[PDB]
């Protein structure tokens, strides 16, 4: 169901990548792989990813401006019951990564490792 070395979980296939990229570069990277940055929209996926990696990795969450809503790459706003997992940030930290079970806003132009998602 998944390309070689992509991990089969729930609906989807997950790829992990240790290239130090900005959020936008990471978005493009996933797009180049016919995939998207991760949507961490429930407790199950939090635990799956947490069990698998301890390194900071970008996810597909960003906001247009510090006073606008956080959205996933699919256009959806972050779910109510996932706010527990989102730490607060400063202004002009408009992109988020996942680290050891929580999501953290940071500078979009900082570089981090990443992971991508596509359908099986």
């Amino acid at each position: 169901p998944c390309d070689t070395n992509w991990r089969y979980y729930g609906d989807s296939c997950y790829g992990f990548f240790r290239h130090n990229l900005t959020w936008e570069e990471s978005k493009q990277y996933c797009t180049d792989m016919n995939a998207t940055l991760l949507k961490i929209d429930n407790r199950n996926i939090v635990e799956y990813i947490k069990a698998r990696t301890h390194l900071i990795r970008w996810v597909g969450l960003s906001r247009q401006k510090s006073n606008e809503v956080w959205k996933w790459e699919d256009g959806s706003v972050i779910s109510e019951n996932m706010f527990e997992f989102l730490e607060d940030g400063k202004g002009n930290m408009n992109c988020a990564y996942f680290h050891n079970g929580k999501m953290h806003p940071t500078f979009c132009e900082n570089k981090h490792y990443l992971m991508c998602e596509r359908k099986a």
Partner: peptide, 10 residues
């Protein structure tokens, strides 16, 4: 699993 993957040179 994902973090310590050591890959051979080509």
């Amino acid at each position: 699993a994902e973090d310590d993957v050591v890959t051979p040179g080509c």
